[PDB]
């Protein structure tokens, strides 16, 4: 009992910058500082933007702020706290059945607005700041206009699918893979986030 370890916090280590005309990834914390912040849960770094790059000791993925909540996938975050300036913050939403978790959005982040356009021309944002056109094909699936090896999408779970006007349509969850090629993606629809709320 006395030696049982604690899992560390999820740590914001960068962001996907969408503020201007060029999308690009920014790193805001290196691997050593990430490891230390994960164990303490105390992250005093400035947060900006809608799409964060996040890490645990063993994985790296994305998280997206919608309606004042920073959302990501359960398969990346599990039940972990997130590091914050005052110490670890507990998830306010956890739904393993949806592969969904959420924490209160960090001070300084910006939130996306849920889409009400009813449009099926979407855009997936990856951890490399690629903006991938995706045609919506059902409630929780979309096809890539240009299929990509799954290598290209790995590490982008938790990222957004957006409509043409930049509203949030969903959270990227899984790639639909044939012979290692992603022809489609599965996502958590923003309406499911809204119901979880
Ligand atoms: C533990 O509790 C849970 C609860 C719910 C759950 N729901 C799940 C749906 C679930 O799927 C598993 C995780 C998820 C996954 O790899 N996502 C990311 C990603 O980038 N991840 S990540 O950032 O690298 C990482 C790994 C966090 C750091 C987006 C894709 C990028 C590339 C695809 C690589 C090859 C895997 C292809 C799987 N295709 C797949 O299953 O397709 C369907 C059509 C669904 C069969 C798939 O995509 N997969 C399996 N695992 C869970 C686990
Ligand atoms: Zn919209």
Author numbering: 983 to 1179
Task: Give the exact sentences the study uses for this entry.
The NS3/4A protease is an excellent target for developing DAAs against HCV, and protease inhibitors have been a key component of most combination therapies. Structurally Asp168 is a critical residue that contributes to an active-site electrostatic network necessary for efficient inhibitor binding. We rationally designed HCV protease inhibitors that retain potency while fitting within the substrate envelope to avoid resistance, particularly against D168A, which confers high-level resistance to current HCV PIs.
Further optimization by modifications at the 3-position of the P2 quinoxaline moiety to decrease interactions with the S2 subsite residues Arg155 and Ala 156 revealed that compounds with a smaller methyl group at this position retains better activity against resistant variants. The resulting inhibitor with the optimized P2 quinoxaline achieved an improved resistance profile and avoided susceptibility to RASs. The parent compound, which has a P1–P3 macrocycle, fits better in the substrate envelope. The reduced potency of the inhibitors against the D168A variant, as with grazoprevir, is due to the disruption of the electrostatic network involving the Arg155 side chain as a result of the D168A substitution.
